[PDB]
Design a binder for this molecule. Sequence first.
Ligand SMILES: CCC1=C(C)/C(=C/C2=NC(=C\c3[nH]c(/C=C4\NC(=O)[C@H](C)[C@H]4CC)c(C)c3CCC(=O)O)/C(CCC(=O)O)=C2C)NC1=O
Ligand SMILES: CCC1=C(C)/C(=C/C2=NC(=C\c3[nH]c(/C=C4\NC(=O)[C@H](C)[C@H]4CC)c(C)c3CCC(=O)O)/C(CCC(=O)O)=C2C)NC1=O
Ligand SMILES: CCC1=C(C)/C(=C/C2=NC(=C\c3[nH]c(/C=C4\NC(=O)[C@H](C)[C@H]4CC)c(C)c3CCC(=O)O)/C(CCC(=O)O)=C2C)NC1=O
Ligand SMILES: CCC1=C(C)/C(=C/C2=NC(=C\c3[nH]c(/C=C4\NC(=O)[C@H](C)[C@H]4CC)c(C)c3CCC(=O)O)/C(CCC(=O)O)=C2C)NC1=O
Ligand SMILES: CCC1=C(C)/C(=C/C2=NC(=C\c3[nH]c(/C=C4\NC(=O)[C@H](C)[C@H]4CC)c(C)c3CCC(=O)O)/C(CCC(=O)O)=C2C)NC1=O
Ligand SMILES: CCC1=C(C)/C(=C/C2=NC(=C\c3[nH]c(/C=C4\NC(=O)[C@H](C)[C@H]4CC)c(C)c3CCC(=O)O)/C(CCC(=O)O)=C2C)NC1=O
Ligand SMILES: CCC1=C(C)/C(=C/C2=NC(=C\c3[nH]c(/C=C4\NC(=O)[C@H](C)[C@H]4CC)c(C)c3CCC(=O)O)/C(CCC(=O)O)=C2C)NC1=O
Ligand SMILES: CCC1=C(C)/C(=C/C2=NC(=C\c3[nH]c(/C=C4\NC(=O)[C@H](C)[C@H]4CC)c(C)c3CCC(=O)O)/C(CCC(=O)O)=C2C)NC1=O
Ligand SMILES: CCC1=C(C)/C(=C/C2=NC(=C\c3[nH]c(/C=C4\NC(=O)[C@H](C)[C@H]4CC)c(C)c3CCC(=O)O)/C(CCC(=O)O)=C2C)NC1=O
Ligand SMILES: CCC1=C(C)/C(=C/C2=NC(=C\c3[nH]c(/C=C4\NC(=O)[C@H](C)[C@H]4CC)c(C)c3CCC(=O)O)/C(CCC(=O)O)=C2C)NC1=O
Ligand SMILES: CCC1=C(C)/C(=C/C2=NC(=C\c3[nH]c(/C=C4\NC(=O)[C@H](C)[C@H]4CC)c(C)c3CCC(=O)O)/C(CCC(=O)O)=C2C)NC1=O
Lengths: 172, 172, 172, 172, 172, 49, 162, 162, 162, 162
Amino acid sequence: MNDVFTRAIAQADLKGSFLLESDLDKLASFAKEGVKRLDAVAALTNNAPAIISDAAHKLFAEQQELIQPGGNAYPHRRMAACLRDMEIILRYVSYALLAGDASVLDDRCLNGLRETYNALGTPTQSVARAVQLMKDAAMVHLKSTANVTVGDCSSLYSEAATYFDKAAASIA
Amino acid sequence: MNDVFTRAIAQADLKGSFLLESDLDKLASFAKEGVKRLDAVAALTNNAPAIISDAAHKLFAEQQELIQPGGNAYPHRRMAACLRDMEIILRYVSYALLAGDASVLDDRCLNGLRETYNALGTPTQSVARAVQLMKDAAMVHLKSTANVTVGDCSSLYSEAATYFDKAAASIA
Amino acid sequence: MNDVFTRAIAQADLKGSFLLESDLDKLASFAKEGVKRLDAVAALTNNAPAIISDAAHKLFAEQQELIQPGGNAYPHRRMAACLRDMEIILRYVSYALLAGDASVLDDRCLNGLRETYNALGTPTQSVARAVQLMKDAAMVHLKSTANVTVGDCSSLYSEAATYFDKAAASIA
Amino acid sequence: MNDVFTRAIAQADLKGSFLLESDLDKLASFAKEGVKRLDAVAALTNNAPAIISDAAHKLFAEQQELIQPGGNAYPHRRMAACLRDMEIILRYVSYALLAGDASVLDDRCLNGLRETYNALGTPTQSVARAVQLMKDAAMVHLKSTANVTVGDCSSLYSEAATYFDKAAASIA
Amino acid sequence: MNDVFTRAIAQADLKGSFLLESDLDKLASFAKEGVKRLDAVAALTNNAPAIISDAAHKLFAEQQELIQPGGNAYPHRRMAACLRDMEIILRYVSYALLAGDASVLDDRCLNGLRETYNALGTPTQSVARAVQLMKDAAMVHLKSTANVTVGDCSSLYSEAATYFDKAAASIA
Amino acid sequence: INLRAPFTSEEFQGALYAIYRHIFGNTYVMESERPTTAESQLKDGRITV
Amino acid sequence: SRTVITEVIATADSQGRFLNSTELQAAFGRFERAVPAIEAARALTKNQDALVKGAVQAVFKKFPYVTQPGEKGYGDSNQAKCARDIGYYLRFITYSLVASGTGPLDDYVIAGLREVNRAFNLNPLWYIEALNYIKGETGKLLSGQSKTEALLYIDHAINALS
Amino acid sequence: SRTVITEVIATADSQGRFLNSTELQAAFGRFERAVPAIEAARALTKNQDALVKGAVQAVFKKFPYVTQPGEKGYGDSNQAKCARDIGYYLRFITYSLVASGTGPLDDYVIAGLREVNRAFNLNPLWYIEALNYIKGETGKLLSGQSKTEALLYIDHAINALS
Amino acid sequence: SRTVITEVIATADSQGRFLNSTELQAAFGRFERAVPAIEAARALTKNQDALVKGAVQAVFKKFPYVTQPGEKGYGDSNQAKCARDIGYYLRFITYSLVASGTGPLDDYVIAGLREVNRAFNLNPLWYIEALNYIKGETGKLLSGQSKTEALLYIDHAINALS
Amino acid sequence: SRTVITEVIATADSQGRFLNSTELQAAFGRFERAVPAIEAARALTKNQDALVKGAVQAVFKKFPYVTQPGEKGYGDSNQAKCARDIGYYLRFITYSLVASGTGPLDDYVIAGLREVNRAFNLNPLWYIEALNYIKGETGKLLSGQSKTEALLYIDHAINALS
Ligand SMILES: CCC1=C(C)/C(=C/C2=NC(=C\c3[nH]c(/C=C4\NC(=O)[C@H](C)[C@H]4CC)c(C)c3CCC(=O)O)/C(CCC(=O)O)=C2C)NC1=O
Ligand SMILES: CCC1=C(C)/C(=C/C2=NC(=C\c3[nH]c(/C=C4\NC(=O)[C@H](C)[C@H]4CC)c(C)c3CCC(=O)O)/C(CCC(=O)O)=C2C)NC1=O
Ligand SMILES: CCC1=C(C)/C(=C/C2=NC(=C\c3[nH]c(/C=C4\NC(=O)[C@H](C)[C@H]4CC)c(C)c3CCC(=O)O)/C(CCC(=O)O)=C2C)NC1=O
Ligand SMILES: CCC1=C(C)/C(=C/C2=NC(=C\c3[nH]c(/C=C4\NC(=O)[C@H](C)[C@H]4CC)c(C)c3CCC(=O)O)/C(CCC(=O)O)=C2C)NC1=O
Ligand SMILES: CCC1=C(C)/C(=C/C2=NC(=C\c3[nH]c(/C=C4\NC(=O)[C@H](C)[C@H]4CC)c(C)c3CCC(=O)O)/C(CCC(=O)O)=C2C)NC1=O
Ligand SMILES: CCC1=C(C)/C(=C/C2=NC(=C\c3[nH]c(/C=C4\NC(=O)[C@H](C)[C@H]4CC)c(C)c3CCC(=O)O)/C(CCC(=O)O)=C2C)NC1=O
Ligand SMILES: CCC1=C(C)/C(=C/C2=NC(=C\c3[nH]c(/C=C4\NC(=O)[C@H](C)[C@H]4CC)c(C)c3CCC(=O)O)/C(CCC(=O)O)=C2C)NC1=O
Ligand SMILES: CCC1=C(C)/C(=C/C2=NC(=C\c3[nH]c(/C=C4\NC(=O)[C@H](C)[C@H]4CC)c(C)c3CCC(=O)O)/C(CCC(=O)O)=C2C)NC1=O
Ligand SMILES: CCC1=C(C)/C(=C/C2=NC(=C\c3[nH]c(/C=C4\NC(=O)[C@H](C)[C@H]4CC)c(C)c3CCC(=O)O)/C(CCC(=O)O)=C2C)NC1=O
Ligand SMILES: CCC1=C(C)/C(=C/C2=NC(=C\c3[nH]c(/C=C4\NC(=O)[C@H](C)[C@H]4CC)c(C)c3CCC(=O)O)/C(CCC(=O)O)=C2C)NC1=O
Ligand SMILES: CCC1=C(C)/C(=C/C2=NC(=C\c3[nH]c(/C=C4\NC(=O)[C@H](C)[C@H]4CC)c(C)c3CCC(=O)O)/C(CCC(=O)O)=C2C)NC1=O
């Protein structure tokens, strides 16, 4: 598994060289902004039930066919699997936010997920829609000014958005 | 796994036949010449560290790209795995030499080795070169006339060369 | 782990003869009261959460010390272990009641149950009291004849009381 | 696991000295009668089920109560277990015979046997009698001078008797 | 396994009360000097092979019967086991030092160590002496003021000595 | 490979080799990654295979 | 109880090694974050009764039917158990603040929570609304990193109950 | 097949180690014992027809009843299968003699023997009688050690049948 | 590689749960310790050539015999490989300083170190002497927390060799 | 210890079967080879003093720097320990010869060799040189197969060292 530091180190090892001063400056800036990054990760973790609940409500309001008999979330076991999956993907998005790298998200969550869903009959368009709705709910929670020090966290917002978008693209 | 005797027996069973007199003569010759085979196997076993060290030195003298950053024996772990591989292959060649049959190389040492190396990304030409170097360094210890009664062991040398070449050709 | 029919068979084979006609009549009577016993077991099974809830309420009403910090039913982990033990005891009582045997009860848990409670430090007399409260709730459920046809069930009630007493006595 | 050679070496290493010329003479003697020992082991192996059957027939013709219901070997599976135990102990006696040492029987067969039979209620006296009956049958089969070169082998008979008697003593 | 904070919370909870002003004072005092304790743990960790080498040299100078044949450190296997045990005990003392509590030293390392040594014939006095010698070397290494900011650490020296003496008393 | 409570050094080391070859999927485990404390507990009899 | 230091030692022990820079830096972060956390614990401890009575009143406001006769919250004993439960929750939140981990929360609350609430028909939403009241009050009883710590632990409790 | 050389190699390979003096001495013992075993196999091969015919007739002598119509030993096909089976047993015994191990008997006759005999209602006592026969004549066909190896293998087959 | 962040994330992942306050505190300590660690890494990067030359000369001073004919220090290739190895250790030490964890050293150097030094007959004491020299020199290149970070990683490598 | 007989019986026990031809032949090879092994044991035991002194001198010739002060071999105590260790190796080689197995060497020397040598900073090349000297002097006063056995066991020890 990787973070920004391990990724840079691996690239330098491939080059066979020391980390350059520009790379050290990039990593210094990363570690400097790490406190904001921890705030964002805590925003994801503390508000996760709300994010999943809002995404699920909007998703099943949009696609009533998913909760009807013959739908892919019809019985309780299928709905529970749906909600479980949503929580798992959000949790690996939070891990990738903390790491600053998407390696854990790719290796663990999105590894063979498209083929799993294809073999299950799970509509991958609807999974991607669910991931988008979680992205929206999360973006509302990470932008919250309450209980933090006001400051510029647009880089974190964009990075979290990239993680969500990469999840939804890998699935669909 | 098979030795020479069980291989003859298996080839005789497909015919529904008892072992012939010529087959029994061949097996009696094999056993009667077995003390030299034991000496050769002891020669491979007792000089195994020397064989592997010599072959490794030559291999990384010819091919510096294996031990450069980015090379496939670069870090200590990859080099350690390389040395394990050489020791394993030499050990199995000694097994085959004792058995008089290559069945233990086919069934065990080379059973999925090419696929292993292909999936890992290991250059199988360099592996075959390592096996060739081990063959070159093992012929010396086989042909060493000290501490043993003198005699004609050209057949044993040829058989050992066929085992080494079988390993090399199954790798590449 | 043997049933009343198997107890009769075991005794018969210990004495080495066939089953006696009086024994055969006793087992026929057991089969005749089998439907009695199945209604009793259904009463135990369907009302099990209610029985355990009532028994726990009464037990922690009459023994407040278990509730307090430092008590044995404190915190949630120990309260859950308490309720789980009550569930296991009631389950075993229903098993024995269906079986018609009490050895199936003593061989099932009661061998290790007491000294497990001792190694933990759990007061065995409080477990006996909990079993007795479960007995009272179980009785007030088996006597309940709503939506069940009416008739004498003195044997079932006596045997259920015997099994509850056996649990509460082997624990304490 | 130990044999005569390893036992002598262990004693010497406890003293911290080399093996003595008397010890070397004794071990050379032991290995000179090795073919005698191989014939004894073959007599035990080739005739093992005949030995077990004869011992079982004699034991049940003597200790009649085991056959009868309520007896130790009465149930058909318990007869199976009886014969299995006899076969196992004969196998380990032949092991100790080939090894030339006794304690290999004591290690993996006899240390955990007495309390096992006591917990199971098996009379150790009957087991010891069964071992002695196998001793007599195997003594008859070992003394058989046909099929083998005639020679004095009283020491082998003494050693086999010591192993059988030690097994019986450990069981009972 | 506990630390000082968890032990304090446990004592508070057994009474059922919030943590007192004195308790929070003591815990904040522990926390403010915790960075001082990190250097003690680092001194233990960074010099562990040197500490164990000095302790082993002095122990086998004092008690030569151990490394003599017949002693319990005589073969390579037993000497390696002895050095491994020194490694283990020093590791657990370092864990106790970082945690501020000896719970890890007693729960995991020393639960049945005396019984193990007694059943194996290890002289527990010798192991306690090895622990004392390790303590002496550890004190020599903790008190080095090179590469650290000079300050009072008699509390850490005392606490480390207590952990070492507790391990020694547990073994002996 | 069956490893009882009492065993010799050869039996122990061979059982360790078999265990690491199967449980780690024929993947190389270097000398630094090998668990010494767990091997010791298994050597004493505190844990079974 | 699983805290920063306990997790440190558990990892090192499981890998059979000494504590090195990774673990020592994690412990360093624990020690640096100690003082706002103990500050929050002190602030929540001084305000025992205000928080607990306010939380009980908040529960009885959000679920008015509970206080009516024939319901779980009717009776003086039930009210006292309201106060006792909210005080237990606050106590373990302060313990977690002290220990720099959810260890006290997991051991004393989160483990066995759902089965106990099922067996006694205690609605987790009551406690969730009480904890939300505690959060709102802590928002002003504390400031800065102490407030962040307290909120993190209260939200862990909530998400365990939700 | 389980032979001396094969078990040597397999035991060394299971521990991931080279062939040492112990295993080389075992191999030496095999290579020395080859001469008696191979010429015993030679003798058994040269006399296969007489041995098999005598074995079939010995089975018919110790079990007269099977010869009568309506049961196993009746008919040309059944007796041809008797001869074929006894030839199979002799063939794999000679195989084991040559290979210096019970491997061929273990892998070709003994693995799956009871299930097959049970399914086809074949008495192991017939084959035991045939092998006791073959044992008796291999006594006089062979002298010295060769007799010894031949009889170890024949008795191994008999023990497998019982 | 095993860093503070990576162990945090792997712990939460193996437990199937979100990152809680304890792990955020560990991460916070990492992000703080980064400033001295990156400063130490930059200082060691500037002076890598001087450090390598000094370490090689220290190795030759403490083991004067290796440079003698017939031993591993004789020839220009062997001493070039000396300089290469010291460069490797220094580079991976700076990697572990940047990464805030022993991961680069464990993965790239320590994993396989013993087998390799044993196969090629490299004495670990040579590298221990070189690393002790580098330790002494960085004692003069750095100060404060940079010094202790660099020293901790250096003697992690040293204990790995011994 | 791992001898021919012990490996035989262990393999037979692991399958839960009796001892048969494929095991008796291995034991036969052991009994055949016993005579050269015991003769080699007598030869190595009679000449043990000269062998040990010559081996120590060979070590000090090949590694002269060891004798210089501040090195491992300086001092009479260290050199006495050298003589003691070479005597240990020779004694266990004699044991292994007698038992016809690597069992004595494995149990008393090989098991734990690397860790013990690393902890006390003992160079395996010293012992390799001493065993090479013992091999050379075993080239004399041993003839034929006994010399072969002694050389095989010494080469086993050397291979374990390196
Ligand atoms: C086949 C088995 C199955 C069951 C049993 C089932 C129950 C169920 N009911 C739901 C909606 C709902 N169900 C209720 C419950 C009712 N509404 C109120 O009028 C009453 C008080 C109460 C009935 C006693 C409510 C309030 C919702 C809306 C919750 C929301 O906003 O998502 C949902 C969420 C998805 C949706 O329909 O929007 C499920 C999964 N679903 C299943 O697939
Ligand atoms: C217990 C675990 C832990 C956490 C959670 C933590 C977060 C943390 N956030 C901080 C401030 C901050 N936090 C943020 C981030 C917020 N501001 C923006 O509006 C966004 C809405 C949002 C991020 C998405 C910002 C911008 C600062 C100011 C510090 C700076 O800009 O350098 C600080 C520095 C002290 C302060 O200025 O208040 C810390 C230590 N540290 C820890 O050890
Ligand atoms: C990335 C981690 C890594 C390390 C650390 C590493 C060390 C390393 N150094 C080597 C060469 C060497 N290294 C040395 C050691 C130095 N030379 C002498 O001048 C000094 C006395 C001595 C000072 C320490 C020697 C003598 C060799 C030659 C090896 C040989 O020919 O046998 C080799 C053998 C392969 C080769 O031919 O290059 C390795 C594996 N390799 C790695 O992949
Ligand atoms: C049947 C017995 C057997 C064999 C033969 C065997 C070979 C083998 N070699 C492996 C790795 C390896 N093998 C090599 C060796 C190559 N490097 C090149 O420079 C050399 C030319 C060449 C060796 C001479 C290397 C470097 C690796 C590690 C690959 C990596 O770490 O990515 C692996 C994967 C295990 C792992 O990577 O941890 C196997 C299975 N395994 C077995 O159980
Ligand atoms: C413990 C393990 C063990 C070993 C190693 C062993 C070897 C062994 N080597 C022998 C002689 C011999 N050894 C050899 C082999 C050598 N001749 C050439 O120099 C080759 C370079 C080399 C083989 C590649 C030869 C040709 C003989 C002559 C005996 C014969 O050919 O029959 C003999 C028979 C003695 C004789 O009649 O001369 C044995 C038993 N025996 C054992 O029990
Ligand atoms: C699937 C489980 C199951 C149930 C639910 C069940 C009910 C049941 N009870 C029966 C007889 C009966 N069972 C009872 C038992 C009752 N006496 C008291 O009122 C108690 C409330 C209760 C016992 C605790 C009685 C009184 C009768 C009828 C009298 C008789 O024929 O003996 C019968 C046989 C009558 C028929 O089918 O025509 C059934 C099916 N039987 C079952 O196998
Ligand atoms: C393949 C397995 C194998 C076996 C079975 C074996 C036994 C064996 N028994 C032998 C003769 C013998 N066999 C015995 C056995 C005794 N004789 C008495 O009648 C007793 C009943 C019996 C006690 C067990 C004796 C005493 C000798 C002669 C010993 C000698 O050669 O000095 C011989 C030497 C025959 C010769 O070459 O002239 C061998 C090799 N060796 C093997 O490698
Ligand atoms: C929970 C942490 C833990 C501890 C503490 C531990 C110690 C430990 N030491 C043991 C044996 C041993 N311990 C020693 C050490 C002593 N012998 C004396 O000679 C010396 C004075 C002294 C060395 C300083 C020795 C030599 C043995 C082997 C005894 C034997 O094989 O008979 C054993 C049992 C067998 C083994 O694995 O070797 C354990 C479990 N193992 C663990 O997993
Ligand atoms: C990577 C892991 C890590 C370590 C190792 C670490 C150590 C560390 N030691 C420090 C000072 C110190 N270091 C010590 C050490 C003591 N001084 C005495 O000479 C004793 C011999 C010795 C006991 C070992 C002391 C007493 C202080 C002063 C602490 C204070 O001012 O409160 C400081 C603060 C420097 C400052 O701001 O003034 C740190 C961060 N921090 C970390 O994150
Ligand atoms: C250490 C952690 C811990 C907690 C938190 C805990 C909660 C708890 N509260 C209980 C009683 C209770 N607690 C309440 C609380 C309710 N009252 C209503 O007014 C409110 C809506 C609501 C408060 C928010 C009620 C109604 C009961 C009675 C439940 C019953 O007996 O059925 C009980 C059952 C004890 C008994 O029956 O004697 C438990 C286990 N127990 C623990 O060991
Ligand atoms: C029975 C198997 C066995 C062996 C083989 C063995 C070797 C051995 N030799 C030792 C001492 C030693 N042995 C030597 C040997 C050196 N002296 C120099 O003249 C030579 C160059 C060189 C020998 C070739 C030295 C220097 C020491 C002292 C190590 C020290 O304590 O610093 C020690 C440590 C003694 C202690 O506990 O203090 C061991 C374990 N021990 C055993 O139980």
